[PDB]
Amino acid sequence: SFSGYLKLTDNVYIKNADIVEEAKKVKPTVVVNAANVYLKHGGGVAGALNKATNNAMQVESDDYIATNGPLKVGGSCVLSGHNLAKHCLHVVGPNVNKGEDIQLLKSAYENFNQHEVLLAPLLSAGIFGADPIHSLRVCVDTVRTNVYLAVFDKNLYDKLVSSF
Numbered sequence: 001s002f003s004g005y006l007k008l009t010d011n012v013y014i015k016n017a018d019i020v021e022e023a024k025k026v027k028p029t030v031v032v033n034a035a036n037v038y039l040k041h042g043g044g045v046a047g048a049l050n051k052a053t054n055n056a057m058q059v060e061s062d063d064y065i066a067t068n069g070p071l072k073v074g075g076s077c078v079l080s081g082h083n084l085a086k087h088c089l090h091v092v093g094p095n096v097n098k099g100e101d102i103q104l105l106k107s108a109y110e111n112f113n114q115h116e117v118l119l120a121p122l123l124s125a126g127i128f129g130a131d132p133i134h135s136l137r138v139c140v141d142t143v144r145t146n147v148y149l150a151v152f153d154k155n156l157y158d159k160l161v162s163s164f
């Protein structure tokens with residue numbers, strides 16, 4: 001049910017869209033969240049996804065952290081997708097604004113390989129501070145499963161496609 005995506009490689013597709021609106025439209029099996037190790041969904045994609053679940057994603061995440069402790073940078077956990085998807089794969093990319101190692105971005109994308117198809121944002125882009133052109137390159141060179149990338153910013157989408 002994904003539509004209006006531009007094909008980049010055999011398995012990677014991209015579209016200028018709000019991932020929350022895309023998730024409500026498609027109801028994918030897996031939506032990826034650009035999480036931090038604490039699953040504190042304050043801003044960016046995480047804040048937007050959480051707000052669409054009426055804060056149910058934050059309640060569930062806090063119970064997960066209380067039981068298991070924080071995730072590793074480069075790591076992930078599968079939780080409920082609530083009203084947006086069957087599951088939400090919370091993936092932690094490196095936040096270069098917090099001094100985290102950019103080499104962990106490839107480890108972050110490797111988490112996508114455990115799922116046949118995913119709706120996702122560019123990891124470590126936005127307020128995580130990494131170069132989005134670099135993040136898209138790591139994605140197509142690491143992910144082997146079917147990934148549908150939603151890029152919110154129009155000007156960034158245009159730059160990604162024209163420079164790919």
Ligand SMILES: O=C(O)[C@H](CC1CC1)Nc1ncnc2[nH]ccc12
Nearest residue numbers: 044045125126132150151152153156
């Ligand atoms: O549009 C995106 O998908 C990303 C992540 C954002 C949606 C959470 N935005 C950006 N990423 C990197 N640099 C940027 N400069 C201006 C916008 C921008």
